[PDB]
């Protein structure tokens, strides 16, 4: 008999510009006549949920409740509790949800890496690495931009924040973009952008192209 909620994440907030409060029911047999509402510490109720979910096929029921509120209150730490009423339980269950107020903040450091030489010999593909290190807490958002237009999220992979061995509390993450050896050898600058709360504008951009580590002062060419 549990009701698990999903608090808004910083990644979702920065992706949709809309903080949402959502809670789901579990360990309850499928039934009907269930109403879900969202309440706050002040006491007044909020907007009504929509988009009723379905019944899990493992003899469990789940109800979803959406409530859109200002992110400032979520950051401030307002206590938000969703109330669900069922038949088997005589007293409705209460699920309080709040952000942890007080975390050491450290801005992430970004490093882009160009594909290996041995990879640019099969003339097939290339993998570019965007490497983020030194950031607390573990709420980071990474996406790739090409020519000022974001790429589809189905051509790069991002990992989950793994704790740093050296500095305790700090975390690290990795994002890989698979491009073509052709595209990479035809200029095409690639940019990885990282969003974190400790960042000044919550945005950070870096670019790498085929010609990035060159001296740009001389140009030596061995010709035979």
């Amino acid at each position: 008999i549990r009701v698990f909620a999903i608090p808004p994440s910083f990644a979702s907030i920065f992706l949709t510009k809309s903080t949402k409060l959502t809670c789901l029911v579990t360990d309850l047999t499928t039934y009907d006549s269930v109403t879900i509402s969202w309440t706050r510490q002040n006491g007044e109720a909020v907007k009504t949920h929509t988009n009723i979910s379905e019944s899990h096929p493992n003899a469990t029921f789940s109800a979803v409740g959406e409530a859109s509120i200002c992110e400032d209150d979520w950051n401030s730490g307002e206590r938000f509790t969703c109330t669900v009423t069922h038949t088997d339980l005589p007293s409705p269950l209460k699920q309080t949800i709040s952000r942890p107020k007080g975390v050491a903040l450290h801005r992430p450091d970004v490093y882009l890496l160009p594909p290996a030489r041995e990879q640019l010999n099969l003339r097939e593909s290339a993998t570019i690495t965007c490497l983020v290190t030194g950031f607390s807490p573990a709420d980071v958002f990474v996406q790739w931009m090409q020519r000022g237009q974001p790429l589809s999220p189905e051509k790069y992979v991002t990992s989950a924040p793994m704790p740093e061995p050296q500095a305790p509390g700090r975390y690290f993450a990795h994002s890989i973009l698979t491009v073509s050896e052709e595209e990479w050898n035809t200029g095409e600058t690639y940019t990885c952008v990282v969003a974190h709360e400790a960042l000044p504008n919550r945005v950070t951009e870096r670019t790498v192209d085929k010609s990035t580590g060159k001296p740009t002062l001389y140009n030596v060419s061995l010709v035979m």
Binding site: L122, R123, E124
Partner: peptide, 12 residues
């Protein structure tokens, strides 16, 4: 002076 792989056994 570059040749681009059209097909391969590595699946590309």
């Amino acid at each position: 002076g570059t040749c681009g792989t059209v097909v391969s056994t590595t699946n590309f």
